[PDB]
């Protein structure tokens, strides 16, 4: 049983779009300091923190306001966690709530036995410098609290998105990209994988990287993996890792051959003695095109 937690107004927009795409066998948790922003979440379970400290307003782009507001509500966080084997902390770094509360939600889930994954977006360079250093030094707090942290800088998204994209649809794509990271790993566990397998990939590895590839036509099984190995969302290239995870999602047409094909183009590009596993997701609503998702652990 897996549970997802959306810290901040950012992460909450992701959890909103995450069920808009329809996701199975993952229980949902939203967390916010703003009272009218958590009003809009579709999550099964909602929690507000810092009703004493913010009293309804957003935590006003201050990290410590979030950090101590979560300490105040330590109870309801412990409530929603226990009963879960794996915990996802999807939260947009930058704001007061996310940059302070999410590092706490994590370290609770870590010392509560469960597995801990941080799927966080860095902010744009177009949001000032002081907003960045917060988010970046908040990744620092995130880094040592979770098991693996999947940094997705939002500046890498400018290549995938248009030049014409406005402000409130530039984050619509960021929600979709945070979805691909969790859904990529979630759809594998609950022709499945062993859970104790992922324990070897994730446990106390550190900084992680994500790559996305989509291919349509004739030679889909290869053009996908190639575009995934050279995705802009990867800072470096995938060779550094001591462990790789691969998700191949395709429609009814997907052949057991195509999977082994794509898996070897990735295995070639990775280090020669790497920990690697992979799975096949049959998603009937997909027409002909498929999608490959790559995770790199331990640099
Ligand atoms: N995934 C995603 N990230 C967003 C979205 N909007 C903003 N962000 C990122 O998240 C950062 C902080 O925004 P919020 O999460 O809404 O702020 P907060 O965590 O609620 O903290 P406060 O400033 O106190 O409200 C920004 O710097 C953006 O980079 C969004 O709609 N989706």
UniProtKB/Swiss-Prot annotation:
<keyword id="KW-0547">Nucleotide-binding</keyword>
<dbReference type="GO" id="GO:0032153">
    <property type="term" value="C:cell division site"/>
</dbReference>
<dbReference type="GO" id="GO:0000917">
    <property type="term" value="P:division septum assembly"/>
</dbReference>
<comment type="function">
    <text>Essential cell division protein that forms a contractile ring structure (Z ring) at the future cell division site. The regulation of the ring assembly controls the timing and the location of cell division. One of the functions of the FtsZ ring is to recruit other cell division proteins to the septum to produce a new cell wall between the dividing cells. Binds GTP and shows GTPase activity.</text>
</comment>
<keyword id="KW-0131">Cell cycle</keyword>
<dbReference type="GO" id="GO:0003924">
    <property type="term" value="F:GTPase activity"/>
</dbReference>
<dbReference type="GO" id="GO:0005525">
    <property type="term" value="F:GTP binding"/>
</dbReference>
<feature type="binding site">
    <location>
        <begin position="9"/>
        <end position="13"/>
    </location>
    <ligand>
        <name>GTP</name>
    </ligand>
</feature>
<keyword id="KW-0132">Cell division</keyword>
<feature type="binding site">
    <location>
        <position position="131"/>
    </location>
    <ligand>
        <name>GTP</name>
    </ligand>
</feature>
<comment type="subunit">
    <text>Homodimer. Polymerizes to form a dynamic ring structure in a strictly GTP-dependent manner. Interacts directly with several other division proteins. Interacts with FtsA.</text>
</comment>
<feature type="binding site">
    <location>
        <position position="175"/>
    </location>
    <ligand>
        <name>GTP</name>
    </ligand>
</feature>
<dbReference type="GO" id="GO:0051258">
    <property type="term" value="P:protein polymerization"/>
</dbReference>
<keyword id="KW-0342">GTP-binding</keyword>
<protein>
    <recommendedName>
        <fullName>Cell division protein FtsZ</fullName>
    </recommendedName>
</protein>
<dbReference type="GO" id="GO:0005737">
    <property type="term" value="C:cytoplasm"/>
</dbReference>
<dbReference type="GO" id="GO:0043093">
    <property type="term" value="P:FtsZ-dependent cytokinesis"/>
</dbReference>
<feature type="binding site">
    <location>
        <begin position="96"/>
        <end position="98"/>
    </location>
    <ligand>
        <name>GTP</name>
    </ligand>
</feature>
<feature type="binding site">
    <location>
        <position position="127"/>
    </location>
    <ligand>
        <name>GTP</name>
    </ligand>
</feature>
<keyword id="KW-0963">Cytoplasm</keyword>
<comment type="similarity">
    <text>Belongs to the FtsZ family.</text>
</comment>
<keyword id="KW-0717">Septation</keyword>
